[PDB]
Amino acid sequence: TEEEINLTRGPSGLGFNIVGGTDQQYVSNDSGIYVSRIKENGAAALDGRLQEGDKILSVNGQDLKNLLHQDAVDLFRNAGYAVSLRVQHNFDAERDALNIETAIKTKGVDEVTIVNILTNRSNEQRQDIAFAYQRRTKKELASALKSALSGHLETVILGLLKTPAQYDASELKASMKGLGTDEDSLIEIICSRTNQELQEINRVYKEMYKTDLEKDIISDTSGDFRKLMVALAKGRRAEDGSVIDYELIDQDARDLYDAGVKRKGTDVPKWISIMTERSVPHLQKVFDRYKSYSPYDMLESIRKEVKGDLENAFLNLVQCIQNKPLYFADRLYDSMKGKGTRDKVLIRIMVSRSEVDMLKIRSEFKRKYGKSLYYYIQQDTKGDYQKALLYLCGGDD
H or E element at residue 382 = none
For Ca ion, the binding residues in 324-353 under the rule CB under 5 A are 336
- The CA-CA-CA angle for residues 147, 152, 156, to 5°, reads 80
Nearest distance, CB of residue 302 and Ca ion, angstroms: 11
Nearer to Ca ion, 96 or 384 (CB): 384
Q: Which stretch binds Ca ion (CB under 5 A): 73-81, 107-115, 268-276, 342-350?
A: 107-115
3-state helix, strand, coil split of the chain in percent (to 5) is 60, 10, 30
Local structure of residue 106 (DSSP, 8 states): S
Q: 290 near 257, Cβ under 8 Å?
A: yes
C-beta nearest to Ca ion: residue:
108
* Element counts in the chain: helices (H) and strands (E): 21, 5
| Residue 294 interacting with Ca ion (CB under 5 A) | no
95 three-state secondary structure? helix
Q: Which stretch binds Ca ion (CB under 5 A): 38-46, 126-134, 152-160, 368-376?
A: 152-160
Nearest distance, CB of residue 219 and Ca ion, angstroms: 8
Nearer to Ca ion, 48 or 178 (CB): 178
| Residue 150 interacting with Ca ion (CB under 5 A) | yes
Q: 84 near 6, Cβ under 8 Å?
A: yes
| Residue 380 interacting with Ca ion (CB under 5 A) | yes
| Residue 108 interacting with Ca ion (CB under 5 A) | yes
Contact pattern from residue 169 through residue 208 relative to Ca ion, giving x for each residue in contact according to CB under 5 A and a dash for the rest: ---------x--x---------------------------
Three-state SS annotation for 223-268: HHHHHHHHHHHCCCCCCCCCCCCHHHHHHHHHHHHHHCCCCCCCCH
Nearer to Ca ion, 108 or 295 (CB): 108
Alpha carbon distance 213, 173 (integer Å): 8
Contact pattern from residue 235 through residue 274 relative to Ca ion, giving x for each residue in contact according to CB under 5 A and a dash for the rest: -------------------------x--------------
For Ca ion, the binding residues in 24-63 under the rule CB under 5 A are none
Q: Which residues bind Ca ion (CB under 5 A)?
A: 108-109, 150, 154, 178, 181, 220, 260, 336, 380
